[model samples]
Target: MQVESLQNLQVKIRNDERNHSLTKKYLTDDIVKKYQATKTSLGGTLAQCVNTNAYNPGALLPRSCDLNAYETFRDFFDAVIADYHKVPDGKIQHPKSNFGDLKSLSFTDLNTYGNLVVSTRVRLGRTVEGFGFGPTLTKETRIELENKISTALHNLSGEYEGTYYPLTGMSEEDRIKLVNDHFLFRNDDNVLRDAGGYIDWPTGRGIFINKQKNFLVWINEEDHIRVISMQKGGGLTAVYKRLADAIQELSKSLKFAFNDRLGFITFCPSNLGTTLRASVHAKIPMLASLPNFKEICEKHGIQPRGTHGEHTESVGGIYDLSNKRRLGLTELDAVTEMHSGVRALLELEVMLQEYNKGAPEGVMPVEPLTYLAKLLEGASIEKCYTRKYLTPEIIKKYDGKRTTHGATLAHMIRNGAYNNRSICPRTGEAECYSTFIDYLDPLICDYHGVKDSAFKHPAPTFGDLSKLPFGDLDPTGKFIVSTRVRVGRSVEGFLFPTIMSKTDRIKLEQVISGALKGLTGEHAGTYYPLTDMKEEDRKQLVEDHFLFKNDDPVLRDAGGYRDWPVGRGIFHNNSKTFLVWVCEEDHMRIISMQQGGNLAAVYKRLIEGINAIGKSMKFAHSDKYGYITCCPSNLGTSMRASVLLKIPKLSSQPKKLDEICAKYMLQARGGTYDISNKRRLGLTELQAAHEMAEGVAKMIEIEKGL
Candidate 1:
């Protein structure tokens, strides 16, 4: 049969050993049989091994392998997928597992020949579901599977090709000679041919055969291959035996890492060819906080996930988190140390190697414990130590003057003498009451508390500032708003419109949970009683908070919230930005706003401004006219960065897109953007204020080269 693909080629090589039977040209039947048998046997074995948890691909091996720790992850994956090696049996003994012939093959038993390759597939079968792999796969799942196989393959490195044996029993010279004979083709022409090409083998592992001589090829041992000659051979059999022993010795010494405990293995046939590549997604929260990370990552050509956190900065400071195919630092350093990437999925094998220190065998899976440890590492050790002997008196002595807000409370509570007696002199009321202080220590678990399940809430950190900006006691009629400034307002909704993590979601849920947990009608986190509301009401108000002035037109009349329904005059007074547009129906859509404004008016103004600039420079889209038109898919249904203030009608807490829209109208079905019926939030609308803030950031970056 003619070979159309690699699979077809494999089938052809395996069926009827026509090439091996006529070993007269190379090695006789006695010498080439073993080589032929191993290939056909392993090929069949591989086909049957990929099922459930019964088989491990690394288990099928007859030799040693050299690999980077992460390199082995693919081999482990082969047990779940498919792995095959093709060979022409005439070069080596095809029938018997012995090295006898030497003269006819033009070399000794030491003269190893034939090309070997090992590959792992992305998936198999017409549908991934048929092979037990799910119908849908995420970058995370794919990366994870690759990680497992890479490790398994590394463990079984010895069985493929010339690395099939260990280098034991051979002297150093013999071992070196065998490697040169079989592998290592070096040539000045080779360098030119592989220029700009990724290191396949010779460049990275330094393995190559001599381009000038057919006798020399990359065999085994060391990073690169060398050369061999049989013209002056005394007994070719003895030389062949030495080469085989050398391969055996090297196989044992340079084993890949698949057998190590860095990862687990699973089956998948969907990743057959191009899909065989492993990829990852990771989150960098610090990039949201610091723009420098984005700049650096962009400079390095690193692709990022644009649906979460600070990805918009890389995309011109807009929160365009669409599910369409698309793909930060400092605080990022701490967060990654804690729980791994918050957003962008990390390559499974890559991260495993980095976190596990090359040898992943002893490493356990990362858990909340790992996160806590990393957090502690990123913390100020000096500060933690200073509080070691802290007591109520000691805390009282310092208070906010020398101690932090959370630290003072932690100290006093630990001593069982914590009190919020210190009041804001203007009101003569404490910033936080003593009762709240009593609960602080438990909620804010210490550094060591992370490993314990009792630590329910993450401890307060500098990052907490991102969530809770303090209200300003500003002089000169200036407002020093807290992070909450964006919460009740449309700022955050407009600025970085994306979903937060389960932890952050829990925080928001807890706020509503405390408010309506009473009057229990089988209360759930997302369910509450609205019995007190008047009859015939179209919406419900389960929770409420104010951000800015309710009567202020700047609060209500801003153009940013044009995506909101026409009836809504009410806006979340506590909202921080317009990144997230939550409507009365609870329909949420992330908007992009680096261009300008969240309100329809602002969008119009921006378009007009750009048009005016184009007119001045004669820079129209068609170069025929200076006028330009603004194009936004969510047009006509002018929505502000405003969220619907309806109560429980918004599908309880509006966890998903459907729940958010269903509360206001039926048009939210299937996340459709019939802007006329369903409200859509524009990035400019959600983050009206944040857009201005980012402009300031842009200006700063321009002025100060930040």
Candidate 2:
């Protein structure tokens, strides 16, 4: 028979040898008549299993219709398991019997190895003691159990706290999307419906999701509750940790039925032990086509489902792969089996793609970064971190300073965090990095505490320093000594702050300085690598205003003091009018200025130099907040355009300069002698610089009159 879809592999009734033989042997005309006479409303009844490869296709196994049938059909269950899943019958392997201190539960960093894994979810089934399984429970009893679960879930606070959404009143649109998104249990599963697990319809059915949507529970579904932990990408450790923690915490309020041998008790016999199913949705288009894909899955006891879960076709080559043998194996073994199997499949996928000499157009394998980049670009993203820059290692390494904003790059990639469709897609500002930050920060802060007080800045937005019209900070060149505009930029691919390695920093410095060399014409410069610089020259460079000082306490605390001046240096233009600060708080500080109050020329130079460097490299940028900087206060544009002025007339007044600076949304420093933008977050770089430039011009005119 021809394979119409991946689902066919699971339930190929006519093709499965064991099921065909098993059905012919046990499904006698007399037995069929006897079972049929009972008129049991089970979809995958004993007789149905006989007719359909002994695979139920719902839970993928059959149950006895009666005691006599179970005694007669016991061999069928064993045969099906042996044939389909190839599970050994010798007692069943388990790591530990007690379920004692589960910290030993381990997981692999699947994303670190490859990009095939799209998302991961690990769910556990449980039934509270004193409650009968769904098939035997009365409507009232089911509702009572539901209420208990709902109450227990609501009592969870902080990250675990969530709202319960009863399925009874859910709108069609919401229900459809919820199921499609795989956030809710399927509404119509004949096996579950027939088994009375879905009795009373949505009367007592509901779903609970934490604020982050990472943790959730389905009340009154197959089991009393299915506590689930899921996230984008394959960070199985985090997923497993959250699931285990939630289960342990919930166990305090409720006791689950358990036995030493049977482990956690559940409705279905298939989910007897541990009752955990750790699965990942991955894309293995090449492997999917090969016949050996199914063989490896069987060998490792891995079950492959369609994209939309069981009995569905894989869309766009994505498949839901999970551990198949849940009953006999320990929790740890089941998880490990799936992990090892998936890794093998990914390795085979790579081998196949490499060996194919002249593959067809769609057959060629696309690496994760390239695949993700094309998807992002197609979605109309204004800017994207290059493939090299947006790797999982780099993203996780340079997390935000605040734990409140704590997020791993692995999670982000799995969830498509960088995709526009994910970041407030309904909002017109979906492409804005600042908007994403505003939306994400509050939620992260609530779960993980803030790292620094400065992280509490207002919502961030980008500035157009490159486009800002140049207005003189001191037009007549009378009161102003010099005009300078500088903005901090970090390389997109490297670790930031304390997390950054010295080797990485050193290599990054050379690449950045090399990029800076491209700033030709008025911005043309020679990079002075700090490693080759003399101590006196390094001291003189800072003294001459060509570089920043190395003594900022905040910088030191951020691990920026290590290998001092090793990967650090300065770049000066031929005219010495333009300079770039390398290895400061950020990777580079593009600066432009001169001896006179020629703010226009200075601003123009800054824009050109920034673009020139940008051509050869990528800088970390945010849509919701603008540019990303190590310091939250210096987020957004990170551009500071200022001029040192000698306004003696106004300076003589005790607070005259302060008043003038405040009036123009500017800041006055060094007793009003040094003035610049007030804050970096709210205003765009160009706006901040322009405000300072215009205010300074007006101040100069006022000083002339005074």
Candidate 3:
């Protein structure tokens, strides 16, 4: 007998306890007719969703409907999924429950069925914010999303690197090969077709496969993006970890539609909780043929699929096994259930092997394993996404350092503050420390706004300390809350940060720490590396003004603070009046400060500290740019002089402060609008300090009148 039409299936559903309002809102007479006429399978899918939750079946429609159709199906879904209200409200706000150390779940050296496992796969679904789901999306929107995702996929470096291929105009041979290899999604999906997800056919469809073919994404498939990670062996942990990493990295650029309660939004209510599906393909001839095989799986809530994919028969005695309870369980719980069930089945296989000792062996599972041939062979190399600054050859020279900081590299490079080609792209004749010749050149050029070919280094120069021009601006402590002046400097022998290794970073930190220990008297204090300190301590340091955090996106993009707390540190005097930042954007940032303005005292202290450090360590310097620093704006002097002044009366006029600072070549900072010297690259340190002192004095006078 033919299957009942979806439209008729709904009437057969006993709605005595069902919410009649949902059916009336979503399944009107016209809507039912529409589904029956075109979406042949939709009626049955809807009927199942309604049957699953008779009181309210709205969540099923919301999960299944595309973004464009969301409004049309909104009322039904709003009533069904209780956690989902609007968007972003019900998101889970904590770390996922432990699935144990993922590393412990490797299938490499198993006891019962190590060789029986053919392959393993783990997948998650995500939809982008501001776009309709596949069924409701227009052709143009689909292409736009494809391009956005394609760019993100290309940005993947290290193990996640890969290429993208659009499905439009693809060759028949390629399509067949992808399907036969089980690397592609099925073309005729009745559920998706009925839901209007296949509109415009292949216009916005594509797939991204990593060099190893272990990682893949099906774009514009059942969801906006279906991230899949799999491997030939049953390394479920590695596969799951890989998928999670890709999703985390993509989340930096892709604003996904999410809610606190749902974790990640999906097209199906059944996939609402963790949205993670972990599975493995295994061969168990004796166990699978048992009469109670189906009964065993149902008891464990493990769903089996054919070798090709879902809804297909098993091939050569191999079955795809995955957990069925995706909605209510935690990610760790779901994975654990699948892991435990697979282990149980493996034990059964072993028991069968013992019982059939004299029986002939059945056919071993076939492993076409075409994807393994595509793996990239070598120690992983780094790729700086901003290629306009240099060629791949230039980047290849530096391998150990972080080349990009998340999604911030391209923007920082385009800002034209740092140069990547200072060492001469052709001649290799540059004469300087290896760190300067290779790494510092690009940073210098970027700041100076000049090409690598035109770059030149200047000799170090300093002003006479005895002839210091400025004295205390607020000796009585009436106007200035605090005064500070800092200069950035880098070591000569070590590799510049763009190419520095973890070993190099550790060595640099040690060298700086050793020097910091000898600081005595007013400058006596211990150095604290970020690695050794607790997170609470670090936050306290920032609050206390003893350290400056490098969380800025622009600096991160330029590879300033790659490994988080690692290789980063702060040092301050016993009196806490002098401070220094070690292994940040620059090798060292020497700072001198005190409560109330004392420009002369601050300058003298700063000079004394630099002199002491200079005696023990060699610093990178440029003839043209006074003190070499990572940022171009700090090229000439590499020093900023400022005073926290309470000038609320003058600060109230925003335009007036800008005009005053512009006239005197100064800048303003702090919540209270303190003024400071602005020109950095072109002026001398003393000159900049003098400008700030005079400018602040003038501003204080104006505030006093107000």
Candidate 4:
């Protein structure tokens, strides 16, 4: 571990790890390979960095800065200052505002400003003199980085014009547009410039699509995606719409696309499945303080379910009420349950939004943006932990009985068979899987064993998974299956093989089997990227890697597994990590094993484990998953994730989410909030903030003193 000598206790330990779906979840093909090589020892040497100066920044001096570190310093300082200025305080501090303490610049304050100038000159002098410069980066490596070229470009702006001089050369309209593009729209909650465009507010990482300019359209082709310093605003409606609109508009005009496909959308359920799923994001200081919220929910509607659909019995007050709950509730039918959650959130948001505007003495507004951000930050972690910590314990309390009745009308609504807004319409022939089953006569159904197979073959479509029978999937804790279907023509032919070439037939079987192997793993059922195993098993299914032997088929394990799509195979391009591999036929059998196999139980366990890790790390609320609320306001579904609001054909910039959805043929649905009208977003700042705070705070406490 120690590349340097024993005296190097101050050496830095830099670790950066990211796990993404092999199906191009993040990163372009090349970038995925690059990062994988950089992170793990995949075809690249370990980057052993030995920094003698770990803490005392000032002591290191500018001379110690290598070309890389010098650039890093400049960029980090500038970005942090920019971020600092985006704060409310930063807004007040701007000279353009002519407001606040600057108006009353005291003698000491003026002196301090002067001192700042002196300090900058001193630092510059030290850097030029190389007071602390050590072995700089190898000159050849430095040369390859083209640092001088970059530095010169950054320095360009006409003599004495400063780094921002390029702005002066632009037309006022262009300059204003730039400001809108880089400054106004590029504030704290949104740094659309980085991560290409859309910001993942919770974790300060994101997926982006760069905007391009056209003279006629006054917009450019969005060609690139990048990652840098940024924070996403929480909740799906705003971020998703902004990204979708910008990207879709760009794609429609330029025909820009990713993968072998064009115009697709995909995301975790919270973001893309249904933009209109209404959620009550509350920032409830009062309810959290009340300490009786959990009791109320348990006494009234029921104990709140965890991310994996398990309840947390360590009991608290606040109920999240932010889930797929409203899918089937009539305005008059489910008022009591809905109101218990919504009334509290509506009350809290009304209060907190005001506090954000003007806080009263002695009370800090529950962190607003963080509330939304945590949905993503904690979403995965919570998904991991709900099963680990809360599920089995709560199951014991429930007496091994089923929670919800079999197939409620509400479940049907969530399954997309019926819509509350639309009246029951006549059907010439039963089209939907459920309807198709219903149309069959009971005598005929029994004759063909239709009762068990009554549901559609793909009944639990990817988007409709949360609505599936959870408790029944894994009653004996054997295993639960979560699968994603790739409806390719090749797959369709393989299922029959009548019309496929002999070689093609083999490929089809490989793809099907590989896909099954990938999705059936332990981690596969949760995070999707790793579960898809199309390429790894391609050989097993297909006799040909190409339709023609010599065709330039894009086949290379860039992420370094046999499978081109890393998430689709048993290996998953990750050798060290373990997964539970099962047969697709077995998955089907298991579903019927204990009434849908009680798969949710296994999901709960996975989520719990992941959250436990997040808690250990003290990652942000958005980072932890298995969050429990000892207080009521913090309780409810402990997962903080959002559904991306999208209309692929309508969005302005439709890149990541829309692209994935289109590729997957994902249909939208309704959940906790209604997003269809687009009048107001489903999850408000308050509701998200309250749950995030509770979840993250408990997470910190759990992780404390470790």
**Predicted model with the maximum TM-score:** 3
Q: What is the C-alpha lDDT profile of model 1 across 304-353, one tens digit per residue?
A: 33444543445432221111111011111211221122122222223323
Q: Please provide, for model 2 over 554-584, each residue's C-alpha lDDT reduced to its tens digit, 9 standing for 90 to 100.
A: 3442345555667787898888788887877
Sort order, TM-score high to low: 3, 2, 1, 4
The C-alpha TM-scores of every prediction are 0.19, 0.42, 0.45, 0.17
| CA-only RMSD, every prediction | 27.1, 26.9, 21.8, 28.4
* Candidate achieving higher TM-score, 2 or 4: 2
Candidate 4 residue-wise lDDT, 1-706, digit = tens: 1124212312221111222111112113332233222321111111111122222222211111221221233222222222322333322111110111322321111112111111000000001111111232232332322232223223322221222212113466854665554321222321122111121211121122122211001110111111111112122222223333332333332322111110111111111111112222223334343223344344344324322222255433322343222212221222234334444344444544443443222222232322222222332333222111222333243222211211111111110111112111111111111332232123222222233333322211122234422233223332222211110011111211111122433353354344434443342432222234345444532342111111111111000112223223222212212222211111110111011223333334333323322232221121111111111112112222212222322233334333433433232333121111110112222233222223222222332233
CA shift at 638, candidate 4, in angstroms? 35
RMSD of 3: 21.8
- Which tens-of-lDDT digit does each residue in 495-527 have in candidate 3? 544334466678888888888878877788778
Per-residue error (Å), model 2, residue 431: 54
What ranges in model 1 sit over 4 Å off?
Answer: 1-54, 57-166, 170-506, 522-706
How many clashes show up per model? 153, 13, 25, 104
User: Which candidate tops lDDT?
Assistant: 3
Error of 3 at 482 (Å): 0.7
Off by over 4 Å in 2: 1-60, 63-106, 171-177, 308-315, 357-706
Off by over 4 Å in 4: 1-11, 14-243, 252-706
